[PDB]
């Protein structure tokens, strides 16, 4: 790929990047879909994060783990 210190092509400078035309109703529908879907996705992500956090807690200073540690200590003693 080009690295920014190169000159850029001579055919490239005279090129108008004209965008796609739009169907209105369809576009609106698409937008709606994006809005809704993304919310759901976000929620899912949040849930996943929460789960991860819970797992971490369990690993570290979750009750069971703590108990186990205590038991081990007792055994050592």
């Amino acid at each position: 790929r080009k690295t920014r210190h190169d000159p850029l092509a001579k055919s490239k400078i005279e090129r108008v990047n004209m965008p796609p035309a739009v169907d209105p109703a369809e576009f609106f529908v698409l937008m709606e879909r994006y809005q809704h879907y993304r919310q759901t996705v976000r929620a899912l992500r949040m849930e996943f994060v929460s789960e991860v956090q819970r797992k971490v807690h369990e690993a570290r200073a979750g009750v069971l783990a703590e108990r186990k540690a205590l038991k081990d200590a007792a055994e050592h003693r």
Binding site: Q39, A43, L44, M46, E47
Partner: protein, 49 residues
């Protein structure tokens, strides 16, 4: 509603645990806001050329 499979999985898990629980699992977007795309950003965070 949860998406098809996740919800099913959750239900299965519940069953395994013991409780029947006919109350279906659901996620809430009361927390999840949707500030639009045309909503403006912040010039403090952007870098100038």
């Amino acid at each position: 509603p949860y998406p098809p499979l996740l919800r099913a999985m959750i239900i299965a898990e519940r069953q395994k645990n013991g409780d029947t629980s006919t109350e279906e699992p659901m996620l809430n977007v009361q927390r999840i806001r949707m500030e639009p795309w045309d909503y403006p950003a912040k010039q403090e965070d952007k870098g100038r050329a």
